[PDB]
Amino acid sequence: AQSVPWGISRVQAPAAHNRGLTGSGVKVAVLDTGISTHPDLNIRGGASFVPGEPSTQDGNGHGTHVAGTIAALNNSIGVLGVAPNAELYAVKVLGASGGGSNSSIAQGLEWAGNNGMHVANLSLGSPSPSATLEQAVNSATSRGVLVVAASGNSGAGSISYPARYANAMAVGATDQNNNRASFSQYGAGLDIVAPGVNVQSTYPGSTYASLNGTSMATPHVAGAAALVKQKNPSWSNVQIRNHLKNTATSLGSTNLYGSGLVNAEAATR
Ligand SMILES: [Ca+2]
Ligand SMILES: [Ca+2]
């Protein structure tokens, strides 16, 4: 039996699926710890930029979990993605420990741009600015990729990098009451928020797990961007970004919530 995780329902993705929008034909790169083969996922390709981890399989679990929130398959098992027909690419920029380098992350972004990805999901952060990261984000953006990044889980009033760079869309996390999750970083640069508490998704070993974090929120937004691109094939990264903010459900102060809660229904109206 297939279950619909609460956050998928909260961003109203099934309404968009009922309009026939499922992310078909949209290329989405997951820059993370990899993505493992899973009965509820379809991986179309990928690349690794971790020294000594030449495969794209996931030795951590984080990347597989993030991938399922974007595109777990619509079928008789498991869970369901915001964009269950999106084309998933596994771009390994983090090692099994969950950490990587600004150089691997930047290589991943360059790969996404060079390979015509439409959306790049970065459920990761670096605590400090890096000109290398910034130029990579800028480069991918100028080639046409929409970069979506997590605000981070320290609870502080400033957001992590590369989410804090202007050309990266910054996503924070809400809970089931549509309040900001205590850990979700906020402040200058925050664009939008999405469910990030008790998020069930796909996990290595053909299983499912629940996790918390802005890493879990971010793929809700990447998924929604995929639905908007299927409806509006000519739209640029910038148009998609602005339309998501414009159609989000306001939750209050932009400092804490950016435009508010991503709404897949209102954005594909
Ligand atoms: Ca499924
Ligand atoms: Ca930003």
In the chain the domains, ranked by start, together with CATH numbers, are: 1-269 (3.40.50.200)
Experimental method: X-ray
CA 185 – CA 205 distance, rounded (Å): 31
Q: Are 259 and 233 in contact (CB under 8 A)?
A: no
Strand segments, DSSP code E, in the chain are 27-32, 43-48, 87-92, 119-122, 146-150, 168-174, 192-195, 199-203, 207-211
Residue 43 annotated as part of some ligand binding site = no
CA 109 – CA 114 distance, rounded (Å): 9
**Residue 183 is encoded by which pair of tokens?**
């850990």
Which ligand places an atom closest to the C-alpha of 122? 2
- 62 a catalytic residue: yes
CA 82 – CA 28 distance, rounded (Å): 12
From the list 32, 126, 130, 259, the catalytic residue is 32
Provide the residue type at 236 as one letter.
S
From the list 36, 123, 215, 259, the catalytic residue is 215
- 215 a catalytic residue: yes
* Short-list 94, 28, 67, CA closest to 204: 67
Give the other-Cβ count within 10 Å of 155's Cβ.
12
- 32 a catalytic residue: yes
Give the other-Cβ count within 10 Å of 255's Cβ.
11
The resolution of the experimental structure, rounded to one decimal in Å, is 1.6
